[PDB]
């Protein structure tokens, strides 16, 4: 298994480093350009902040877990379960954006009163706490417990499948993801109707931007859904051949992929970022 193992170990670290560089460049761009310091974007950081730590921590974790290394069960679950707290603080941010964009476009006139710096910061702080609670509840006691005090760590053996499908997927991922869908659908279809008869120019522009942040949400789902849908079959259908390891490894990575694309979309769609990305590459690296 010296060959097959290896393609994985690289494609992973390749992605791990993209995620550090792509999302540090986001977080830098915001620190720099005032025009970027707005509520909507503090959530796009909290998202970058997370997709960073996927590269620094989650992927290394995903690689040592890959092998089936030995550890005590509780000090083991943390490696298994730290990707989950990050996945969570992704969805909280992705949703916080979608609602910020609902308010801004459906109820423009009250956005000022309603959305502010201070509140955004608090929301972000709260979510990170929940994200930790939700991420590593298996550490809390909902867990499944070489060397006599140790345990061979394989995700599907220390993290329970019923926690993975009910409390992680149905509850904490599929729901926010759906009602994200509910929220964007109402913004775009409302606007389609509203544009046809009637600031006309301004609506188009703040919509266009939403379609951009919506496409982010789109891809998160595309990236995670395959893996979650497998966790469903693996559990709900035990009278089914368990998905094979090549398809397993695919969707493990496919997921890690999501931490890379976010910065490329900001660049390919959103001028204010593209311009701040350009200017950082021009002034700080090329000089």
């Amino acid at each position: 298994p010296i060959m097959g193992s290896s393609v994985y170990i690289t494609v992973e670290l390749a992605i791990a480093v993209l995620a550090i560089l792509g999302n540090v460049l986001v977080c830098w761009a915001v620190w720099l350009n005032s025009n970027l310091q707005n509520v909507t974007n503090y959530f796009v950081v909290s998202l970058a902040a997370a997709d960073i730590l996927v590269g620094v921590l989650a992927i290394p974790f995903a690689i040592t877990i890959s092998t089936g290394f030995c550890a005590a069960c509780h000090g083991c679950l943390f490696i298994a379960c730290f990707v989950l707290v990050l996945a969570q603080s992704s969805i909280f941010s992705l949703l916080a954006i979608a609602i910020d964009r609902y308010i801004a476009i459906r109820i423009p006139l009250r956005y000022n009163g309603l959305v502010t710096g201070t509140r955004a910061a608090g929301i972000i702080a709260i979510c990170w706490v929940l994200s930790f609670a939700i991420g590593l509840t298996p550490m809390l006691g909902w867990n499944n417990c070489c060397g006599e005090g140790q345990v061979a760590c394989l995700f599907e053996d220390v993290v329970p499948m019923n926690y993975m499908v009910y409390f992680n997927f149905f509850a904490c991922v599929l729901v926010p993801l759906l009602l994200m869908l509910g929220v964007y659908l109402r913004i775009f279809l409302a606007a389609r109707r509203q544009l046809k008869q009637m600031a006309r120019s301004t609506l188009q522009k703040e919509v266009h931007a939403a379609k951009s942040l919506a496409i982010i949400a789109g891809l998160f789902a595309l990236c995670w859904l395959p893996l979650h849908i497998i966790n469903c079959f693996t559990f709900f259908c035990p009278d089914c051949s368990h998905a094979p390891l090549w398809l397993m490894y695919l969707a493990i990575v496919l997921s890690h992929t999501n931490s890379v694309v976010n910065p490329f979309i900001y660049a390919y769609r959103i001028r204010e970022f593209r311009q701040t990305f350009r200017k950082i590459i021009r002034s700080h690296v090329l000089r």
Partner: antibody
Amino acid sequence: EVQLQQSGAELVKPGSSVKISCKTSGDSFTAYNMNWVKQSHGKSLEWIGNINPYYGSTRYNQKFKGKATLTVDKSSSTAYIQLNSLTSEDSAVYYCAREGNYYDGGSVRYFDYWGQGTTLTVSS
Amino acid sequence: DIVMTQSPASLSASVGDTVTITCRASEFIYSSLTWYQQKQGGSPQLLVYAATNLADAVPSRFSGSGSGTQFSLKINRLQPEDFGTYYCQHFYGSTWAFGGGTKLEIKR
């Protein structure tokens, strides 16, 4: 379309003060910042400051800190500016202008609607 | 505080010819710059916002361009109505300024 209707021309002694009106109408006054702009010598255009009419928080240009004072009466949808220790350097046209704002990734910002302006003439 | 530099201060031109006006920022303001038109005894009219965006009811013959420090407004096909003074203004950060302005005049 916000409709901005300012007060009429003033003529005041040096050392005196003066409070110009801007009555907004036919839109949310509290939804967007109300700015002031000084046109002096017929061409020169300075930014005086703005007020967030909801919170009544003010950002002033350094130049006009300790001259201009941005107040707001929310019930009537009226923004004020008071100018103190008036000297002949103060004699100019002052405009209220509404600051549009939306998100395309950044905070977009433009003075879209302007008052008819107001002539302050200071002489002893 | 960022200084804007507008040029030319004055410029004369016949109806139906093309013209351009320049605005330099003393610091990088990205695309945060607005153009306005003032006719004799009128208020500023918003002309272009966000460096490149035509305000509604501004004719299509008007258009702005640029990013960072150098921004120009081009008026394609001058009409009688287009004569007047033109100003640029930045909206970067917490404290803003205008240009000196540009009196467009009739050439004879």
